[PDB]
Enzyme design. Structure first.
Site, PDB file in Angstrom:
ATOM      1  N   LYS A   1      51.998  30.738  49.871  1.00 31.95           N
ATOM      2  CA  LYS A   1      50.709  30.663  49.816  1.00 31.95           C
ATOM      3  C   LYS A   1      50.070  30.382  48.478  1.00 31.95           C
ATOM      4  O   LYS A   1      48.918  29.802  47.997  1.00 31.95           O
ATOM      5  CB  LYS A   1      49.922  32.104  50.416  1.00 31.95           C
ATOM      6  CG  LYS A   1      48.410  31.822  50.944  1.00 31.95           C
ATOM      7  CD  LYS A   1      47.869  33.144  51.505  1.00 31.95           C
ATOM      8  CE  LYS A   1      46.558  33.198  51.915  1.00 31.95           C
ATOM      9  NZ  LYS A   1      45.903  34.471  52.352  1.00 31.95           N
ATOM     10  N   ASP A   2      51.004  31.196  47.550  1.00 35.69           N
ATOM     11  CA  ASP A   2      50.492  30.928  45.922  1.00 35.69           C
ATOM     12  C   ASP A   2      50.583  29.458  45.701  1.00 35.69           C
ATOM     13  O   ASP A   2      49.980  29.104  44.729  1.00 35.69           O
ATOM     14  CB  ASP A   2      51.638  31.926  45.190  1.00 35.69           C
ATOM     15  CG  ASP A   2      50.824  33.243  45.121  1.00 35.69           C
ATOM     16  OD1 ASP A   2      49.670  33.457  45.277  1.00 35.69           O
ATOM     17  OD2 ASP A   2      51.682  34.110  44.616  1.00 35.69           O
TER      18      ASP A   2
ATOM     19  N   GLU B   1      31.743  27.457  22.639  1.00 33.12           N
ATOM     20  CA  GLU B   1      32.547  27.057  23.763  1.00 33.12           C
ATOM     21  C   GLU B   1      31.577  27.720  24.913  1.00 33.12           C
ATOM     22  O   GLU B   1      31.339  28.841  24.950  1.00 33.12           O
ATOM     23  CB  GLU B   1      33.858  27.809  23.608  1.00 33.12           C
ATOM     24  CG  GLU B   1      34.851  27.012  22.477  1.00 33.12           C
ATOM     25  CD  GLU B   1      35.711  26.033  23.062  1.00 33.12           C
ATOM     26  OE1 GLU B   1      36.772  26.289  23.635  1.00 33.12           O
ATOM     27  OE2 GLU B   1      35.196  24.861  22.948  1.00 33.12           O
TER      28      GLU B   1
ATOM     29  N   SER C   1      48.184  46.277  45.841  1.00 32.60           N
ATOM     30  CA  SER C   1      46.999  45.450  46.086  1.00 32.60           C
ATOM     31  C   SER C   1      46.240  46.181  47.138  1.00 32.60           C
ATOM     32  O   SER C   1      46.604  46.836  47.984  1.00 32.60           O
ATOM     33  CB  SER C   1      47.584  44.167  46.394  1.00 32.60           C
ATOM     34  OG  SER C   1      48.027  43.470  45.257  1.00 32.60           O
TER      35      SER C   1
ATOM     36  N   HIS D   1      51.745  47.838  40.663  1.00 36.83           N
ATOM     37  CA  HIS D   1      52.867  48.228  41.367  1.00 36.83           C
ATOM     38  C   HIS D   1      52.898  49.658  41.972  1.00 36.83           C
ATOM     39  O   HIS D   1      53.305  50.009  43.127  1.00 36.83           O
ATOM     40  CB  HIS D   1      54.144  47.951  40.712  1.00 36.83           C
ATOM     41  CG  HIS D   1      55.496  47.861  41.509  1.00 36.83           C
ATOM     42  ND1 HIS D   1      55.559  46.836  42.381  1.00 36.83           N
ATOM     43  CD2 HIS D   1      56.523  48.699  41.822  1.00 36.83           C
ATOM     44  CE1 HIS D   1      56.837  46.840  43.075  1.00 36.83           C
ATOM     45  NE2 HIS D   1      57.469  48.081  42.757  1.00 36.83           N
TER      46      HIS D   1
END
Ligand SMILES: CCCCCCCCCCCCCCCCCC(=O)OC[C@H](COP(=O)([O-])OCC(O)COP(=O)([O-])OC[C@@H](COC(=O)CCCCCCCCCCCCCCCCC)OC(=O)CCCCCCCCCCCCCCCCC)OC(=O)CCCCCCCCCCCCCCCCC
Ligand SMILES: CCCCCCCCCCCCCCCCCC(=O)OC[C@H](COP(=O)([O-])OCC[N+](C)(C)C)OC(=O)CCCCCCCCCCCCCCCCC
Ligand SMILES: CCCCCCCCCCCCCCCCCC(=O)OC[C@H](COP(=O)(O)OCCN)OC(=O)CCCCCCCCCCCCCCCCC
Ligand SMILES: CCCCCCCCCCCCCCCCCC(=O)OC[C@H](COP(=O)(O)OCCN)OC(=O)CCCCCCCCCCCCCCCCC
Ligand SMILES: CCCCCCCCCCCCCCCCCC(=O)OC[C@H](COP(=O)(O)O)OC(=O)CCCCCCCCCCCCCCCCC
Ligand SMILES: CCCCCCCCCCCCCCCCCC(=O)OC[C@H](COP(=O)(O)O)OC(=O)CCCCCCCCCCCCCCCCC
Ligand code: HEC
Ligand code: HEC
Ligand SMILES: COc1c(O)c(C)c(C/C=C(\C)CC/C=C(\C)CC/C=C(/C)CC/C=C(\C)CC/C=C(\C)CCC=C(C)C)c(O)c1OC
Ligand SMILES: CCCCCCCCCCCO[C@@H]1O[C@H](CO)[C@@H](O[C@H]2O[C@H](CO)[C@@H](O)[C@H](O)[C@H]2O)[C@H](O)[C@H]1O
Ligand SMILES: CCCCCCCC1=C(O)C(=O)c2scnc2C1=O
Lengths: 125, 431, 385, 62, 55
Positions: C228-229, C272, C206, C202
């Protein structure tokens, strides 16, 4: 890596006719493959600005160049988001791709380096 | 560069300087505000004001003489300036005002017109000269219930209740001979003045000594004069410094030069070689500051003063400054000490040698009164240059590291944190 | 002002999810973060509901999971969701991390953002592993044995830390019960760490695919990126659904449907899939101590990238040599994984050793060298003197 | 009243014959507090950690 | 108290000296307590009972 260092190496190569004819053609090919020109950007527009040297530089940049840098950056983001490139007649030409910010960056680095030198000067009696 | 002084009945001191154009003569007494009481505080300032009164001043003006006087903590001085030729007519005006007119200057029409002037004077000081008002209060709390706490200009309350009898009472106890020094600076020779003095005899209250008291002591404390209507915040902070005639008088004065003084508006000031400037200039923590090593007979004050308009970041101002002072005990560099040496010499020079004899008179009289002689400028430089990093470190470890402090401020000081916060910064954590 | 701005609680939501100024050009690679929050929720929710029917005792653990599978209404959906969800959690994390690598997201001024992310990655590995041990199948027991033994490599006290961790002579009832307690705890530490990650994000915001500033053209998080998410959230769910209902055991190991046995280790052990690259690195060093140190270093080396990237521009978008080598690194990682699934045999051991070399060389040699060369190329291609 | 006339603090002030009196007491107090606190923290940490060691019922010698 | 100024000299006690003292304290104190405790309950302990037993 500082621009002072980039210039040192780059100038040395540029002066010597041995490397100057060997490298530059490769560098020119590299710049075209990068493709930033197809987005309407000049290389100097790509320099990461989040540091003091670049903030000083952009602050000293004359008004007309500043408004232009702004238009180029916005135009680039819009094209990118549309997933297209600008029409070829709008691409930045090689003659235009000039290091306009470089002189301000180098001046600031020297000023900075001097201060670092002076704050740490020893004294011999 | 000659310090000549001889005693016959009165201790005569002079410092001749050929090219001068003028010459100044006068007496300097070894008693100032530090000798008054809380109730007669302001008597000395009053004397100075009548000695310069319209009546007395007009008499010397006809004669082509100029008057000057200064009240300090440890001393007091009355000076008459003249041309190099009338070096005798000054001695007449001096004796005429301290023996003949020591009752004519105190008329019920002169004293009342003078008292009305110092009252508008001292009042004006408290209402507008904030930086000095604060420094004065700093001495007030730092040395409370002790001599050095008394303000030189005196308090408005002890002033308006002062009568002619008090002037006389003080004068008859301090304006004595054994507590005096006749000074002569300008161009006149030591042997030129000493003759005009040893000519006129008369002792006038000889053998008499001034009263004694209790030694001055430092006390960690503070006085906060908050005033939200002022546009800035003025604060002064200090630790117990060095008295005149102390083995560290110079180390201290050098230590203050390291941080020196600053004025955020003067371009050159911003470029100085003081590490503290890297910290305060980012957010512009203050309009100015200035360190000092004040020295007196019994004690002194080492610290700084500052003024600021950044009223929401005062804690950072105080925090950074006190972090820098911590360094004097553990990490001060050779080049910082060296930068100080040069700058100390430059300022000590400009003080001891300006184009004004009146300053020379005060300095000469004041010094000869405390150590029976004056230290030559060249003798000082030798001491200054001899200071090593180890000296500064030993001094700071004694005077600055984890030691009580004194604070005083006025204006928008809501942001100046509590005592213990400031006090804690006089040190650093370690393993 | 609007209530969403003035209320103490709503303003937090407003500044992070509604009015947050986003760079107009970010692409779908920036959708992985939200997908990671979703994964975290799915893991916590399905985990708590199963915890209601689970017994941690070593004599009942395996059967209690079978009980969840056979008797609990919708139980198999819960287990397959939790299990397949862990895998999807890593697929998405690698893409989140790779995205950061490619675009220079780790660069200044987002170093703190990158370092907190490394811590989260470590905590996630630890969490999934502890969960793996709770099934108490054959793979579970040996995994619990191997990973706890990893600490014996420490000189002097090492074997002590181990008997301490076990709470006895070997992996037993005190082990699995403390592992369950721990598996429940750690996810809440990841959540707190995820909040610090977001706080660090924050302050500078971004980055974007061009690698330059976004300050000249931002658009609100609300509407544009919320919707969009949603696109990738649904796509993510569709694919997870296909595994959960149609192929629930493809990403697991058959040996875990066999109760743990202290006396017999399976003839073929394949960890795994998301741990394979690390398993290969461990196996490639013929020394015990050096083996574990190099493996841990494979993760910590991520911390070095902000310093070894010598470039003057952020990201690989306009860099020919860097893009090329970026992909050598990606496929080298996949190769390491493939080697991890093979037996320690001839062509594989040497291949594993070279791939390990390449992995570390990318961070310590290739990136600094290449970025320097690219800096110079950029200069001499335009300066005329 | 005049701000230069500092109020009375006689009842609070210690007759300074031993300047470093309050300092020695305060520093001893803070020091002892630090000493005992560290010992307690050590004991508490050890109590929790040792609770993970082998239980009395599992140390069987076969 | 001049007893303080001889060891620490107008400075506070540092972490290192605190930690060091803590380790010493932990051992000395535990012995002092276990001692006083066992002496107070002399005759009731197993030690005391074991002596009065012969097998
Ligand atoms: C045994 C092994 C099994 C392997 C398991 C697989 C792992 C799954 C775990 C994660 C699954 C969920 C993750 C979903 C997102 C991941 C993809 C991603 O980030 O790509 C971004 C990438 C960036 O796109 P962009 O630059 O921002 O987009 C411009 C759009 O055209 C801008 O356009 P738009 O917004 O207007 O519309 C965009 C687009 C948006 O479409 C989307 O859903 C978002 C992007 C997804 C592309 C498909 C990925 C394939 C996944 C399978 O919608 C479309 O019309 C495109 C349809 C594409 C086909 C999707 C497949 C349908 C399959 C049905 C089953 O999208 C791609 O080009 C995908 C490249 C392929 C990468 C695969 C590597 C992963 C391995
Ligand atoms: C991160 C990069 C991923 C690397 C993983 C690729 C591994 C694929 C290996 C192919 C293989 O032989 O798997 C065998 C292993 C096991 O082989 P194995 O267990 O049958 O070998 C001998 C054992 N017996 C005798 C019982 C037959 O299969 C798995 O557990 C993994 C398959 C899924 C991989 C998930 C990748 C999705 C992304
Ligand atoms: C659980 C929520 C409990 C709600 C608090 C109850 C209450 O009485 O709220 C009263 C409050 C009114 O307060 P308010 O109007 O802002 O101020 C008075 C006038 N100025 O009204 C409110 O606070 C209304 C807010 C409702 C929103 C509640 C939850 C929003 C969810 C996001 C939480 C964000 C904070 C996350 C903190 C970290 C968590 C790990
Ligand atoms: C501990 C180590 C942590 C790090 C390790 C990394 C983990 C391995 C990663 C596994 C898969 C992640 C791959 C991520 C793709 C690269 C990320 C990225 O951001 O790609 C951007 C790139 C093109 O973008 P761009 O340059 O902007 O296009 C021109 C628009 N101007 O996009 C492209 O060029 C297209 C995308 C190509 C995808 C190739 C994927 C191969 C993956 C194989 C999966 C394994 C199968 C078994
Ligand atoms: C859990 C994820 C599943 C979410 C389910 C999606 C809900 C469907 C959305 C339906 C739209 C309704 C509508 O018209 O709203 C108008 C309303 C206002 O419309 P307007 O007047 O035209 O602007 O818009 C909204 O508020 C839409 C909000 C959608 C919230 C969905 C959450 C998306 C983020 C995903 C990340 C989550 C994981 C993180 C943890
Ligand atoms: C990290 C932990 C920070 C604790 C801070 C310092 C706390 C002081 C504790 C004093 C206890 C002491 O000296 O015990 C000796 C006591 C005996 O010492 P031992 O012989 O060496 O085992 O040790 C204990 O039993 C300590 C554990 C119980 C404490 C009970 C008191 C309530 C506080 C609990 C705090 C737990 C926080 C988590
Ligand atoms: C108690 C709450 C709880 C939380 C919170 C939780 N789990 Fe689990 N998890 C369990 C239980 C119970 C099991 C055993 C049942 C099972 O095998 O699915 C389990 C098992 C696992 C397994 C083994 C899957 C298998 O093959 O059976 C993995 C892997 C795992 N968890 C990963 C995670 C991850 C990753 C997270 C969180 C980010 C998480 N868990 C959070 C309870 C939880
Ligand atoms: C090793 C790195 C790393 C890990 C692991 C990591 N992150 Fe991030 N995250 C980043 C970086 C770097 C950014 C900045 C991306 C940018 O702006 O270029 C970021 C950005 C984000 C964003 C912003 C949107 C986006 O995807 O760019 C969100 C949300 C986020 N991360 C969530 C998470 C969550 C939730 C987890 C895992 C539980 C996680 N991250 C783990 C490195 C990491
Ligand atoms: C600057 O850039 C951004 C950006 O900032 C953000 C925020 C997003 C959007 C994404 C996110 C905000 C992801 C955030 C995720 C989280 C905060 C997850 C936190 C996690 C948790 C696990 C919460 C914990 C949950 C619980 C304690 C409760 C669950 C359990 C329950 C309900 C049990 C109930 C029991 C019974 C018996 C009924 C972007 O897409 C983005 O891109 C450009
Ligand atoms: C939660 C677990 C608890 C662990 C133990 C608790 C913490 C104990 C910390 C103990 C000592 O930490 C110690 O504190 C003293 C202050 O009292 C510090 O002293 C510092 O401030 C004092 C006081 O102005 C100065 O005299 C001194 O010169 C200076 O170094 C010392 O440098 C530091 O080392
Ligand atoms: C970052 C940590 C990477 C974990 C590596 C350990 C991988 C690993 C082994 O080395 C092993 O021998 C066995 S036996 C059963 N499961 C495993 C396992 O997961």
């Amino acid at each position: 890596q500082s621009f002072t260092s980039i210039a040192r190496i780059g100038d040395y190569i540029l002066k010597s006719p041995v490397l100057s004819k060997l490298c530059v053609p490769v560098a020119n090919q590299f710049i075209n493959l990068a493709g930033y020109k197809k987005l309407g950007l000049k290389f100097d527009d790509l320099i990461a600005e989040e540091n003091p040297i670049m903030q000083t530089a952009l602050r000293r940049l004359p008004e007309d160049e500043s408004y232009a840098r702004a238009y180029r950056i916005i135009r680039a983001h819009q094209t990118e988001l549309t997933h297209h490139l600008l029409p070829r007649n709008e691409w930045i030409k090689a003659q235009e791709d000039v290091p306009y910010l470089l002189p301000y960056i180098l001046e600031a680095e020297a000023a900075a380096k001097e201060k670092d030198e002076l704050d740490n000067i020893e004294v011999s009696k | 560069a000659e310090v000549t002084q001889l005693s016959n009945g009165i201790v005569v001191a002079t410092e001749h300087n050929p090219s001068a154009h003028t010459a100044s003569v006068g007496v300097v007494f070894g008693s100032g505000a530090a000798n008054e009481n809380p109730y007669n505080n302001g008597v000395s300032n009053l004397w100075k004001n009548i000695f310069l009164s319209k009546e007395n001043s007009a008499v010397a003006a006809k004669e082509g003489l100029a008057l000057s006087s200064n009240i300090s903590r440890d001393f007091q001085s009355y000076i008459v300036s003249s041309l190099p030729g009338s070096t005798d007519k000054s001695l007449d005006f001096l004796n005429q005002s301290f023996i003949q007119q020591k009752a004519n200057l105190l008329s019920s029409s002169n004293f009342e017109a003078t008292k009305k002037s110092v009252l508008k004077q001292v009042q004006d000081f408290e209402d507008n000269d904030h930086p000095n008002r604060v420094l004065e209060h700093l001495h007030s709390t730092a040395f409370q219930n002790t001599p050095l706490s008394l303000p030189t200009r005196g308090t408005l309350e002890s002033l308006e209740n002062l009568v002619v009898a008090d002037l006389e009472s003080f004068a008859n106890n301090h304006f004595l001979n054994s507590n005096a020094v006749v000074v002569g600076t300008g161009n006149i020779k030591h042997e030129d003045l000493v003759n005009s003095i040893e000519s006129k005899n008369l002792s006038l209250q000889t053998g008499t000594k001034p009263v004694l008291k209790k030694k001055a002591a430092f006390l960690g404390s503070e006085v906060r004069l908050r005033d939200d209507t002022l546009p800035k915040a003025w604060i002064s902070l200090a630790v117990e410094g060095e008295p005149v005639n102390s083995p560290n008088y110079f180390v201290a004065k050098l230590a203050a030069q390291i941080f020196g003084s600053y004025n955020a508006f003067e371009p050159a000031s911003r470029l100085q070689g003081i590490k503290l400037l890297d910290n305060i200039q980012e957010y512009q923590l203050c309009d100015n500051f200035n360190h000092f090593s004040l020295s007196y007979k019994d004690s002194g004050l080492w610290g700084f003063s500052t003024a600021t308009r950044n009223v929401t970041m005062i804690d950072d101002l105080i925090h950074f400054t006190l972090k820098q002072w911590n360094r004097l005990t553990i990490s001060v560099t050779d080049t910082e000490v060296e930068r100080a040496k040069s700058l100390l010499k430059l300022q000590l020079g400009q003080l001891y040698e300006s184009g004004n004899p009146v300053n020379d008179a005060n300095l000469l009289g004041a010094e000869v009164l405390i150590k029976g002689s004056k230290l030559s400028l060249g003798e000082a430089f030798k001491k200054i240059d001899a200071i090593t990093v180890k000296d500064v470190k030993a001094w700071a470890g004694k005077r600055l590291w984890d030691q009580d402090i004194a604070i005083a401020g006025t204006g928008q000081i809501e942001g100046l944190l509590d005592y213990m916060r400031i006090r804690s910064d006089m040190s650093m954590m370690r393993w | 002002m609007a209530f969403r701005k003035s209320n103490v609680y709503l303003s937090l939501v407003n500044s992070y999810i509604i009015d947050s100024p986003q760079p107009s050009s970010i692409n779908y690679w920036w959708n992985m973060g939200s997908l990671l929050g979703l994964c975290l929720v799915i893991q916590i929710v399905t985990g708590i509901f199963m915890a209601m029917h689970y017994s941690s005792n070593i004599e009942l653990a395996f059967s209690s999971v079978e009980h969840i599978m056979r008797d609990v209404h919708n139980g198999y959906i819960l287990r397959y969701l939790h299990a397949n969800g862990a895998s999807f959690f890593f697929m998405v994390m690698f893409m989140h991390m790779a995205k950061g690598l490619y675009y220079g997201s780790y660069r200044s001024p987002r170093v703190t953002l990158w370092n907190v992310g490394v811590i989260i990655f470590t905590l996630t590995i630890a969490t999934a592993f502890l969960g793996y041990c709770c099934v108490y199948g054959q793979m579970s027991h040996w995994g619990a044995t191997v990973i706890t033994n990893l600490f014996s490599a420490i000189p002097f006290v090492g074997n002590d830390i181990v008997s301490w961790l076990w709470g006895g002579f070997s992996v037993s009832n005190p082990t699995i019960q403390r592992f369950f307690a721990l598996h429940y705890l750690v996810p809440f530490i990841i959540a707190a760490m995820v909040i610090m990650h977001l706080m660090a994000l924050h302050i500078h915001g971004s980055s974007n695919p061009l690698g330059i500033t976004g300050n000249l053209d931002r658009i609100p998080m609300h509407s544009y990126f919320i919707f969009k998410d949603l696109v990738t959230v649904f796509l993510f769910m569709l694919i997870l659904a296909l595994f959960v209902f149609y192929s629930p055991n493809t990403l697991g190991h058959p040996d875990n449907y066999i109760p743990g046995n202290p006396l017999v280790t399976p003839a073929s052990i394949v960890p795994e899939w998301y741990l394979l690259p690390f398993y290969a690195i461990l196996r490639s060093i013929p020394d015990k101590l050096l083996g574990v140190i190099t493996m841990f270093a494979a993760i910590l080396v991520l911390l070095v990238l902000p310093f070894t990237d010598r470039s003057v521009v952020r990201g690989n978008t306009f860099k020919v040599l860097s893009k090329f080598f970026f992909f050598i690194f990606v496929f080298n990682f996949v190769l390491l994984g493939q080697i991890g699934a093979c037996h320690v045999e001839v062509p594989y051991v040497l291949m594993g050793q070279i791939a390990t070399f390449i992995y570390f060389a990318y961070f310590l040699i290739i990136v600094p060298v290449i970025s320097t060369i690219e800096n110079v190329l950029f200069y001499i291609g335009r300066v005329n003197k | 009243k005049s701000t230069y006339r500092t109020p009375n603090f006689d009842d609070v002030l210690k007759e300074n014959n031993d300047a470093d009196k309050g300092r020695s007491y305060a520093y001893f107090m803070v020091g002892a507090m630090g000493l005992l606190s560290s010992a307690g923290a050590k004991s508490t940490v050890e109590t929790f950690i040792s609770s993970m060691t082998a239980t009395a019922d599992v140390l069987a010698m076969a | 108290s001049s007893l303080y100024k001889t060891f620490f000299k107008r400075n506070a006690v540092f972490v290192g000296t605190i930690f060091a003292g803590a380790f010493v304290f932990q051992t000395v104190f535990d012995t002092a307590i276990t001692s006083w405790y066992e002496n107070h309950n002399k005759g009731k302990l197993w030690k005391d009972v074991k002596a009065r037993i012969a097998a």
